[PDB]
Amino acid sequence: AVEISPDVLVYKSPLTEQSTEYASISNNSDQTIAFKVKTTAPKFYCVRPNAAVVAPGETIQVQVIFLGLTEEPAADFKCRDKFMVITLPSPYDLNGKAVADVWSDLEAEFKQQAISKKIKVKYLIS
Numbered sequence: 001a002v003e004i005s006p007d008v009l010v011y012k013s014p015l016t017e018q019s020t021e022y023a024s025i026s027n028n029s030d031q032t033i034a035f036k037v038k039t040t041a042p043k044f045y046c047v048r049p050n051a052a053v054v055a056p057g058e059t060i061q062v063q064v065i066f067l068g069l070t071e072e073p074a075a076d077f078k079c080r081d082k083f084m085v086i087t088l089p090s091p092y093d094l095n096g097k098a099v100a101d102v103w104s105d106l107e108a109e110f111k112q113q114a115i116s117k118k119i120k121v122k123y124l125i126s
Helices: 099-113
Strands: 002-005 008-012 019-027 033-039 045-048 051-054 059-066 082-089 115-124
Touching: 002 082, 002 115, 008 019, 019 033, 019 051, 019 082, 033 045, 033 099, 051 059, 051 099, 082 099
Parallel strands: 008 115
Antiparallel strands: 002 019, 019 059, 033 051, 033 082, 045 059, 082 115
């Protein structure tokens, strides 16, 4: 019962300026989870946080900051950028380490338990 949304991040207005849309991870289970957000276009989006733990009953909001294209908005363009949210059980105390520190161990131990979600991106004039 991990919920990840939305299906599509929609950036509007001047695509020549920075803009922020939001994703969300809610842990409705009884067990702490960890998530990680992968970006196919890291030169254009800043993600924060890109990895974190979510306690039972907690919702974490993820900032997806579009850095903009001070260039050409383009007429009749289809954005192909995508984000992949991967969520895993996080049953161990991190011992002060960051989630990024332990992620590879978590994914190696709990790959079968993963709950993944591919978030698409859309540009909207105007």
